[PDB]
Symmetry: C3
Subunit: 227 residues, 3 copies
């Protein structure tokens, strides 16, 4: 009878996973769907399903049904990261030069695996969104106070380029803009949200105003969230 | 022993779903594949699989293996829906103006969910096809009798534009053409069929000849069928 | 107790498939993941999952986790397949003229089914690669000895065109080049590898230097391999 009890529970787990490393579910949204009660917390979801042993630790915003992958590493430290030699200041790709590109998900799993689980969510979600902060000292993120212009605004590489202005479908929005005046380290917050998830996540960033001897910046990278 | 009997049946259901709200399958085509006998009828299929509680009531053409989603609402009523003021007559988007866009699947399920189940079928099916009727009084659908021309022909928004003429890959075909002469309410039937399912379903419609005081029309929207 | 034993094994099979026609798994890579030990060999994988009865016999390179579909038919025989009348020699599509296009997977399964299993793997894999050999007598594959040029090089239809030169993202690489001198039947080997798997497999081939009375060629088509 004990064996029967063990089997039945096991079977129930199969019909509905419970989010644990041992019993992951397809998206946070389903976990939400099949486990209405469960509260937002770290949960294990396996987007490509099939084998269960390659799921990923995501954060479920169990309110929205969003699945949110923290990006590793999470942050880029504060430093005066670039030279200021040209009178003209030009866009630079952090990851491409000096710099690393942002990686998303479990460090442990191989590239080809982190690609495909991400690929499914990214290919098959209703929409995706991602937030990113630019810490600044003496460095214009988006709006230049003195020009009242975005010419200085930075760029982001969706995977596709996200700019302040240009085709609307590819323009990030700003959520706050601390870094608009030069004088003595403040934060700007950007956001990209779309129905073509394939466009996310943000892998690289390009600050236009940079390399001043005065100029220093850091970043922290918010999770890419699929719904 | 009764418990064992209940488990075994339960397990069998898992290996093969039977199409019911409680035990849905991935596509009508599989239901057809794993249940060769079952006759065309309303059945419950769950394209994104995973959680079972968000499947959709489709029609299975169990002959073809097509999965056919009736679109809600099904029809647009007969009415003289638009003004005729310009000497020139121009294309108008029903949904965009005066008008609503066609929604597909369960009313009950959320947008983000109806998106993703549709997205999978739509992204991953061999081909899709959809039929649409234009009821008419004193209104040219496709072929103008007097010109022997399609200039008057209408348009449809695949999601992409489907026109009578233009790039071949994006031209609808006509299955019958009642509305070719003005004089005292007849039906034309259009069809789009493709291997890039992503292009369907039809969400919006644009009649070129419209708004005459004389002019009146209705529509009924056939299901979007995936194979 | 025997029934319980049968159920438990059955359940275990469900959690992890074992690659057999009866118990297939999603990709060779998972089979590799959930069955680390299993050696490279013919195995049964079912990419669209759902119903189990429509899987496909693939080769698992259980070292790489690649899933490799042998293409049917495997080879095109040696023959002087084309006319040489024009002083100018021009590209010809074997399949399009004189010729057949390459089909991949189980002969038994219907087109719409072989499409969708391939579609998933092809849509959802980390990368794909495919190798193809051009047997030659008196026929330049890629490099012309006398010109030291690729002008004569052939083409391949990815599904998209793969050429010796052109946009880099769409250029095949050569792995060996036997057919560079005219005089009395040697082999060249081509390869396309990409992260946009949608581009593969190779369905058609176009030799630029062909139809000489002297000129004869065969092909054998290597499998399209998904990872
Ligand atoms: Ca998995
Ligand atoms: Ca579902
Ligand atoms: Ca299957």
């Amino acid at each position: 009878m004990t064996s029967l009890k063990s089997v039945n529970g096991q079977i129930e787990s199969l019909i509905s996973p419970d989010g644990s490393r041992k019993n992951p579910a397809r998206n946070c949204r389903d976990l939400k769907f099949c486990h209405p009660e469960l509260k937002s917390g770290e949960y294990w979801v396996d987007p490509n399903q099939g084998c269960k042993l390659d799921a990923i630790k995501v954060f479920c915003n169990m309110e929205t049904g969003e699945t949110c992958i923290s990006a590793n590493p999470l942050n880029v430290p504060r430093k005066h990261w670039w030279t200021d030699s040209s009178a003209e200041k030009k866009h630079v790709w952090f990851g491409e030069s000096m710099g690393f590109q942002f990686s998303y998900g479990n460090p442990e799993l191989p590239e080809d695996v982190l690609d495909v689980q991400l690929a499914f969510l990214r290919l098959l979600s209703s929409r995706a969104s991602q937030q990113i902060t630019y810490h600044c000292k003496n460095s214009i993120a988006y709006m230049d106070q003195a020009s009242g212009n975005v010419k200085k605004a930075l760029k982001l590489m969706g995977s596709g380029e996200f700019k302040a202005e240009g085709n609307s479908k590819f323009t990030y929005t700003v959520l706050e803009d601390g870094c608009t005046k030069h004088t003595g380290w403040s934060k700007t917050v950007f956001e990209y949200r779309t129905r073509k998830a394939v466009r996310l996540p943000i892998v690289d960033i390009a600050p236009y105003d940079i390399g001043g001897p005065d100029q220093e910046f850091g970043v922290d990278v918010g999770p890419v969230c699929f719904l």
